[model samples]
Target: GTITSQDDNVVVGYWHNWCDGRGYQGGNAPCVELKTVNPQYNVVNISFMKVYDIAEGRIPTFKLDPTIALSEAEFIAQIDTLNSQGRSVLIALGGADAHIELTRGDEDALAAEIIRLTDLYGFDGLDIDLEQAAITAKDNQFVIPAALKMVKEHYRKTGDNFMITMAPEFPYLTANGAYTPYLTELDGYYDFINPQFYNQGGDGLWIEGVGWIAQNNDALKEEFIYYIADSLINGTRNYHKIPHDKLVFGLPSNIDAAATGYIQDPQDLYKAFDRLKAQGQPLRGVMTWSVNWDMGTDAANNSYNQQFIKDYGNFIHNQLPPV
Candidate 1:
């Protein structure tokens, strides 16, 4: 909303633990360690650290690319090193298949586990990517109004450097979806929402088991990215925007990284960003589905992130620019 000239743009990319595809082609995705991450980007969200298992009453442990010999120690060191350098690394919870919902039964334990990991591994914050049945827009749900309070309040008590973000599908933010109430419940405790613009092509969302909208539906296309993006940013600016400067435009890196027919050139998105800027929308910058998938060697295009940086440059990682 401020649309100030103080900052340039932010590139918040996602990083995953497991091998995506680069390794399969023999380009050494297993060698794609955390240290190789570009310093130009602002934030890196560790795709998923899983969720608190109510059955087990604790956060689930995970292996970061066990096939490639990645260890939990190296993972933590990477996060620690990046955070120390001023780039934020958030421990993402849940995923398309990960059921990371919270309940009154184990919410306290959930909060405790999150805090523990945040400290132990030195994460800068948390990211929510609940999909499918786990997605919600309800009021006062244990995960939303309650658990969010517990988590954000914990961050607030400590200091202001910590953050929280959400990654919802575009449907969640529309009139046909249920994310409005969920966002309303955020109460300024959260940061930006990286609403996934990929997928949902012709037949993704459903209401009561019925197809919700067609392929041409609201801002789902690459050219229409700005259309949906404008809605989210403008609506939130009128309602609740991220504590950060602009809306984080979430995207996938490769053609097959998401559902079929979703990938597009990063240069194509630059036009969208420029249009948004012209219309007075603050451009928070780009956030890809992962730096893991488009690892600069992905066949035809090679790394959505590399092209993104080449096209949408700036920041110098500017929360405060270098001297």
Candidate 2:
């Protein structure tokens, strides 16, 4: 069964344990709470739900203490609840800090994990972040082919219909710059590629204000512009290998000026959307880095940060109409 409705655009919301976990400190209440409290957002993306920190030799690291490793029964129960409530859950593997890679000979192990989890939990499929792997020195490019091979092999053996996805760096240039030769290797293997468009240094107020005041603004704007341009261009290039229908463009619900210590106005996101829409790109949908940050009541909350998710949903629906 297709996870998305006939009208194509998917508006995804992500929930991070550390960021949003406080709201429901003692129970599974947050999951249910979010459904009622934030109904505008469609499709929920849970991060680092099932991951192994390969840097530590493929061991699972639970950001929360003692780790919440769900047993097969518990996993299936939660999945049933999600599906029954008309929500779709995609198990994210490898996050910004996690260094799990498919290129390593752990294809069987990874595939087994996916199959076991899906079978046990009734999950829809897998979403690979692989950000740590994308950066050089880590040299994770090799995992692309290996992962695809393992995924395909698994399907052939089990005949189970599943989804394979990757959360690669946005603006194809980053991926190309990191792993050029294996660029298209992941095309046929993944059902979708979610390109992250946030956390890119120098594109927001922090960089702008600091650079301007410091009189060293020469490279700030240009650098950000190039990153955006590269993302669009590279995205186009990568799509040539994968079907356009399979590409999902990512958008940020919250902004950080960590590099320049300058936080951006959430409304700027709407502007960014307007600019990108004018470009007439073939984007499936926009994926937010997280839902909690936009929820207006988390520890990570800032001045205009919390309102991003709701505001963005309204903007997209008004302008794009969910297609």
Candidate 3:
């Protein structure tokens, strides 16, 4: 049997533990409570345990804000409850603001801390969202890979354990060359490479050979623009030797998800996926930036970023693997 987060064609949604506002688009969706995250997400990536500091004499430091949840004990209990229902809950490390990078030191001690975090939260696995300099690909002197190796080795040995994934910006996975090899080196242990296809992608399509081609006219709207997926998954560059089945296409879920530039829902979304399916590159899954935006933090006023992100999985195959 396969052991991967991309299994059953998952539609992973990242859930932030610290959302404290309201929903978007006038939808009075409740604040994201771990207990009620089901219908919308079967695979949830707990968004961001920001890096506090790294390699400062001792081991690195990371943490979720104290205001994030009801309490640490309650948070873990909720995770336990989710897992009991066969859902997968993972700890996503790093974010756009996180500035963490590990050096070549204290391999054993660092691995111990990593394991402690996993065990403490009952997390099913880990998600590497370390952005910027922290993603630099290096042969050695990089403790991120080393720390992961230690965790991967420990989990795979158990009868049932963690699922690993990475969410890198589109540029890092492709065009940009800084973080490429770091992911490639973690091949055997990695389960999903969900590249964020938003924030970038400019004004048009990213064709395989032709490159970023501008959308011709309104008529082309009938078919979604998936040129980004095309280039990343099937283009000639042969990115990291990553398989299509293990790849997930990620995007901003709400208007707040990015500064700007979001594809319209339903019609546009379908066109893109249909184009991918037509080419026989039906990627394993799709993911959105967050669950927080989908369910507003505010209960006072009713507004949400549309429920499209919540309905996103329903549009895809209902084959999302348990957990």
Candidate 4:
């Protein structure tokens, strides 16, 4: 029943294993430790590295593999801990160098893995990060639909309330190319899709060269939001037939002004919510790339970062209506 509801917006905090790893020195040390300190924040997704390692060898190969130290029992225990604390967990499949290829036959393998993890850990669902799949050859096209179909079929047979989500590139790039066709076919299998809207200029128009490079330009910022909103609106309208309720706005926590990139300050992020609230947009809540970069104890001491969370949490609590 919770899965069927459309009224609630999904607000999520991402935790990446890279910066949060015990080994990493720079870029916010002790990243994974944020959830322990910030319990009030709804950490919906933990973008751990290497689902392929699990599927292929049942052992993690990456240095900072979140799944490395924990056994199946321990991993499920951790999920139970987070769930009891009122947080939902979803394992992100595929990251940086890892490539997930779930072709026609590969689906059964992927589905078995999904069912195993969900049954073991009581997770809410799966989030597919097929970034590497984007650049793979066309002959490998069946991977998308095959993977989705198998996952959906498993959910249906078990009558489980598991969700299937995708982290696709921006709609602008996907739409103007062959990527749209692949995504459209897989849309029905997904409960919702979160498009990455960061790094592009705010203009709403898809410019060819260096669009996101012009930071400090207010015009570009305005354009970026406008274009992002427009792309979300129009792309959903035309390609996927997905309503705004099924969409979550992706925001960046890190700020790079000179790169012509501006991370939304807490106020501005909430303002975007306010704007959508006014328009009666079916906008879901926000999802940043990684929590380690933003919410760790080291970063939280910063005024801008602290305010960002306070404002974001307050907006979600007082402003957004109940689902």
Best by TM-score: 3
Q: In model 1, which range of ten residues has the least summed lDDT?
A: 1-10
Evaluate model 3: give its lDDT.
Answer: 0.63
Q: Which 10-residue window in model 4 sums to the lowest lDDT? A: 20-29
lDDT of 3 by residue, 35-88 (tens): 766544767888776545534444544455576556777777787877766677
- Provide TM-scores for the models: 0.76, 0.64, 0.80, 0.74
Q: What C-alpha lDDT do the candidate models reach, one value each?
A: 0.58, 0.48, 0.63, 0.52
Candidate 3 all-Cα RMSD? 4.6
Better of 1 and 3 by TM-score: 3
lDDT tens digits, residues 1-323, model 4? 12221235555656565444321222343444433524544545556435445356522122334544545566556667766766667767656656443344555555576666666556666675656444353333566456557766767786654666666556433444544545666666666667666554432444455355232345455445444554465563234333556666665555511122445444445555556556766466656565554554333344225434554555564545433
Candidate 2's error at 186, in angstroms? 1.9
Indicate whether candidate 1 or candidate 3 has the larger lDDT. 3
Deviating ranges (above 4 Å) for candidate 1: 1-8, 20-31, 51-65, 137-141, 203-223, 236-246, 260-267, 296-305, 313-323
Off by over 4 Å in 4: 1-7, 18-26, 33-37, 40-43, 49-74, 132-141, 171-182, 200-223, 236-242, 256-264, 297-308, 319-323
Q: What shift in Å separates residue 248 of candidate 4 from its native position after superposition? A: 0.9
- lDDT string, candidate 1, 30-116, tens digits: 235777777765678776766435475334333355765657787777776776666777777777566455554565666777677
Per-residue lDDT for 103-139 in model 2, tens only? 4566555556666655555656666665544444232
Kindly indicate the candidate among 2 and 3 with the higher TM-score. 3
- Candidate 4 TM-score over all chains jointly: 0.74
Clashes (N, CA, C under 3 Å) per candidate: 2, 4, 16, 9
